[PDB]
Amino acid sequence: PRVGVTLSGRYRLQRLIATGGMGQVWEAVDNRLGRRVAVKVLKSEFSSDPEFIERFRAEARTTAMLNHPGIASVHDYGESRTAYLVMELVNGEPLNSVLKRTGRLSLRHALDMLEQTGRALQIAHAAGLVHRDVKPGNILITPTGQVKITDFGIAKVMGTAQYIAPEQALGSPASDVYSLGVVGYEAVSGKRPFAGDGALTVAMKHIKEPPPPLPPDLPPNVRELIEITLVKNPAMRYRSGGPFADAVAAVRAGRRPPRP
Amino acid sequence: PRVGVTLSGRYRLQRLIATGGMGQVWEAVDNRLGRRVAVKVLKSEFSSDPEFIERFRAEARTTAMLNHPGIASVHDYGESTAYLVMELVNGEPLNSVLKRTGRLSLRHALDMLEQTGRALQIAHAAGLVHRDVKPGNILITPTGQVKITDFGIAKAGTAQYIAPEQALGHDASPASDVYSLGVVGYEAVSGKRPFAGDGALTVAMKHIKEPPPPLPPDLPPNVRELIEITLVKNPAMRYRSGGPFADAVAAVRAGRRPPRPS
Ligand SMILES: CC(C)CC(CC(C)C)O[C@@H]1O[C@H](CO)[C@@H](O[C@H]2O[C@@H](CO)[C@@H](O)[C@H](O)[C@@H]2O)[C@H](O)[C@H]1O
Numbered sequence: 001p002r003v004g005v006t007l008s009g010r011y012r013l014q015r016l017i018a019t020g021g022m023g024q025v026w027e028a029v030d031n032r033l034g035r036r037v038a039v040k041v042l043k044s045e046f047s048s049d050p051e052f053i054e055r056f057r058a059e060a061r062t063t064a065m066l067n068h069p070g071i072a073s074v075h076d077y078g079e080s081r082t083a084y085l086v087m088e089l090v091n092g093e094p095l096n097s098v099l100k101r102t103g104r105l106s107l108r109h110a111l112d113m114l115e116q117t118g119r120a121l122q123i124a125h126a127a128g129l130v131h132r133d134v135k136p137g138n139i140l141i142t143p144t145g146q147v148k149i150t151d152f153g154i155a156k157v158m159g160t161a162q163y164i165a166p167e168q169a170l171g172s173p174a175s176d177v178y179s180l181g182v183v184g185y186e187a188v189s190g191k192r193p194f195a196g197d198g199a200l201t202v203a204m205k206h207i208k209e210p211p212p213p214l215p216p217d218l219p220p221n222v223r224e225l226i227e228i229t230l231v232k233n234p235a236m237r238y239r240s241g242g243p244f245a246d247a248v249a250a251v252r253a254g255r256r257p258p259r260p
Numbered sequence: 261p262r263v264g265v266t267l268s269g270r271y272r273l274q275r276l277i278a279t280g281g282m283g284q285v286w287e288a289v290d291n292r293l294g295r296r297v298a299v300k301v302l303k304s305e306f307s308s309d310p311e312f313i314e315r316f317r318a319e320a321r322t323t324a325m326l327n328h329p330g331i332a333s334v335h336d337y338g339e340s341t342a343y344l345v346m347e348l349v350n351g352e353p354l355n356s357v358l359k360r361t362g363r364l365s366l367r368h369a370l371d372m373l374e375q376t377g378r379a380l381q382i383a384h385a386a387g388l389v390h391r392d393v394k395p396g397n398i399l400i401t402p403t404g405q406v407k408i409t410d411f412g413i414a415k416a417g418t419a420q421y422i423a424p425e426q427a428l429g430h431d432a433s434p435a436s437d438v439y440s441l442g443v444v445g446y447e448a449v450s451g452k453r454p455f456a457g458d459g460a461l462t463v464a465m466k467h468i469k470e471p472p473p474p475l476p477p478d479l480p481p482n483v484r485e486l487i488e489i490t491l492v493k494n495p496a497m498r499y500r501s502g503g504p505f506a507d508a509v510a511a512v513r514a515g516r517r518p519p520r521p522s
């Protein structure tokens with residue numbers, strides 16, 4: 001769609017915020033409530049296909065099950081036909097753009113935003129859900145330092161391949177924990193663990209190859225925590241975002257990260 | 261607005277949670293998103309009156325304007341009778357909590373006071389005054405989270421918690437909400453409201469002229485001071501907003517004296 005488009009005679013679009021996996025994120029107005037909201041609309045070509053509509057209907061129902069200030073909230077879902085998902089409008093920048101300008105984040109910043117993400121993901125984990133795509137691009141950062149987990153689009157290309165779980169790369173809530181570890185690694189050092197020219201290389205590295213060592217400037221408790229999340233076996237790592245967030249909180253207090 | 265009823269063919273009303281002044285609070289189901297929501301429906305008596313319809317539309321718009329975990333979120337607004345789709349909170353009004361407990365422990369009372377201050381500061385920063393802060397409007401979850409509700413009489417029942425200036429027909433200000441919260445604070449720590457009597461006029465006149473009765477000597481002085489400052493009759497000599505109030509509570513929690521309002 002374009003700027004002047006009023007979805008179902010209520011949601012008048014304004015600015016195009018981003019262009020995600022299958023849908024476009026839009027800055028919009030609710031004519032009934034008179035408030036600014038974010039609207040996710042399916043791309044012109046995907047709006048015609050029923051496999052892309054039933055994948056988008058799933059994102060709506062999944063996100064609406066979650067209630068946490070660390071999860072971009074869902075208000076509505078409609079079809080005008082253009083399938084749209086009405087959400088909480090967040091004044092933030094993705095961790096994608098943050099780490100591009102800053103390289104890495106300070107020990108205080110990284111561990112605050114890691115626990116924030118774990119406490120956010122545990123809400124999704126306790127409901128029996130798995131995000132399946134935890135990456136800086138799906139983590140929004142407001143100027144007040146608040147994390148907002150977005151895009152549950154594939155909840156059960158090189159983008160997902162850079163932080164993919166080894167079991168997923170082969171064919172669970174431990175996977176979101178794993179991915180967040182890879183996210184943590186990049187945020188604490190300023191360079192991803194597995195890196196290559198292609199997507200299939202980075203994904204194959206995640207299975208057979210062991211993660212490269214972290215810089216020695218990093219404390220032992222932070223180093224250990226990244227290594228417990230980055231194990232090939234999904235049993236040898238934290239079964240959910242919560243036990244992980246609990247282990248992040250220990251490293252924040254000066255303590256060691258526990259064994260799951 | 262009867263039980264079974266499915267609003268706009270989407271929101272099935274299940275259980276009447278509460279009955280306010282303008283409308284009813286219902287535990288409902290969003291058949292579209294497949295989630296359990298709370299629906300505020302206009303009382304059938306007022307459902308067709310234009311004065312109440314505008315008052316309900318304003319409440320819908322005011323609440324939707326606020327985004328904070330300590331305030332119950334707005335999802336949708338419709339007219340099937342007007343209805344307001346909101347976040348479903350598994351909580352209990354401070355009203356009923358205090359009826360069972362009598363008085364909250366200093367640790368709990370100060371935690372609920374801080375949370376309410378922080379939540380109201382969002383509305384105050386937006387330039388809105390709640391105008392009806394009372395224990396019945398403060399939801400408490402089993403995890404101990406405060407959820408602020410009912411912006412029905414908010415400006416850009418009341419009697420027991422009304423601010424002196426608010427009783428004197430003065431313009432609304434965030435300091436008025438600060439006073440009302442101090443009345444909730446006085447009640448939470450002592451198990452008794454400061455001003456009493458049959459008839460609202462007496463209670464309202466007590467908020468204007470009568471000084472609040474002394475708090476139990478069993479209480480810490482840092483706590484007693486915080487309540488005493490918030491209950492000043494002059495809003496200029498009181499905490500400006502929910503934020504400054506919450507900061508003074510944070511100082512008391514840390515075992516310090518509350519800072520003097522700016
Ligand atoms: C303070 C208000 C909201 C009123 C109070 C109700 C009254 C009737 C007793 O609610 C209690 O609040 C405390 C403090 O948050 C909770 O403990 C947890 O507090 C946490 C806060 O840090 C954690 O330490 C831990 O989960 C505690 O158990 C209780 O589970 C909850 O029942």
Ligand SMILES: NS(=O)(=O)c1ccc(-c2ncc(Cl)c(Nc3cc(C4CC4)[nH]n3)n2)s1
Pocket residue numbers: 017018019020021025038039040072087088089090091092093094137138140150151
């Ligand atoms: N979802 S995505 O495609 O990963 C994605 C990529 C980039 C996104 C982005 N960037 C900047 C801002 Cl200011 C923003 N605001 C939002 C977004 C949302 C929710 C509806 C998705 N609420 N507020 N969003 S969102």
Ligand SMILES: NS(=O)(=O)c1ccc(-c2ncc(Cl)c(Nc3cc(C4CC4)[nH]n3)n2)s1
Pocket residue numbers: 277278279280281285298299300332346347348349350351352353396397399409410
């Ligand atoms: N708003 S009121 O009339 O003061 C009022 C009095 C009592 C209320 C109450 N009691 C128990 C529960 Cl479990 C509950 N849950 C809610 C309610 C909402 C909607 C209204 C914001 N979300 N979750 N609400 S609400």
